[PDB]
Symmetry: D2
Subunit: 112 residues, 4 copies
């Protein structure tokens, strides 16, 4: 149930395809569209546990470059209403003097 | 630059190819935890970084499933590449395990990794 | 405002008083009632927040050790108070457990809690 | 052992006094001095385990206000070269429109040297 169009809390849209080998590929939202790549556990447990996954987006496309990248780590939860629960790290490229403030942390919840 | 073999402070091995689309591909082998042999990684990087001395932002994911064993978990590394006589990849990571809704609050570990050439 | 009784998404109880000097003191309730699961908290907040609608920055710590149990672990919450009337406290936390040097890479959990008054 | 003057890799002086009832009090460094308050495990294991700790500093004093606070979470590793390893979270006050980018994360290592 991972393959699909997902939306987070701020109307961002993630279109993902989950290959049977464990690959995740797709798009993050024209000038605002970006490539995404990740991996997921293609053989989760069955004690009712979520499926672990993750992905990465570099905020560079042919229209802009913000010099940074975000990784989302979390799990897909199946049920009457499917969701993906994640936490994320965004890192910006900095000078070494500035490295201490290069990384933001947050959380996102996605729904179809 | 980024392409090559790196080692973190625990001895884990990171073998990467940085392509010109900004794709990261390679394998990861962990010196710790419930992992054995190599795992597939996939990632992205800024392939047109600032020319100002700023590091190179990157990120990647490893799901710890291979033919040897499955830890039902995935890790992401977010950080930057700093070139030079002692080139480095400084990262922070999130490790999420599959849990039941009830146990979710203890699903995610956080830490930092430093990768160097030896 | 910040002073009062709050609870997070899992029903845990936080009893906090904000001091005139930016001090935060109070108690963490794991169960509603049980005293064996009652823990001392302490923190700091911004006693003079910006006037443009920004929240109020805050932080606090709970070490999981009282008269009855010692988990050998400690949690810190970082986040902000947002008043108005819905009034919410939004945080991120870090829980560390004492470990050997060899297992330090698995000593800290991370998450987010939201509080209701 | 915990009580003392600690320095991080970036300079900053933290002065902490450890209390027998698990409390932590001190200052982060006069217009750049701030109150720090925290807790720790005053009965740690002797199996080689580190002592769990946490503290908070809100960056307002009688001179300045940055509208931000930081929490540190980690453990004291005593022994030959006493050290405190930590992960930290800094939050600033934001509108809740800028809320997704209100919180920075990093790690700090402290020595008495």
């Amino acid at each position: 149930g991972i393959t699909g169009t997902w939306y987070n809390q701020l109307g961002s849209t993630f279109i993902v395809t989950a290959g049977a080998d464990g690959a995740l590929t797709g798009t993050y939202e024209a000038e605002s569209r970006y490539v995404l790549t990740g991996r997921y556990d293609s053989a989760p447990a069955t004690d009712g546990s979520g499926t672990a996954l993750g992905w990465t987006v570099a905020f560079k496309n042919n229209y802009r470059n913000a010099h940074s990248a975000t990784t989302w780590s979390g799990q897909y939860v199946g049920g009457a209403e499917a969701r993906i629960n994640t936490q994320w790290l965004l890192t910006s490229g900095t000078t070494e003097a500035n490295a201490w403030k290069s990384t933001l942390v947050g959380h996102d919840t996605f729904t179809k």
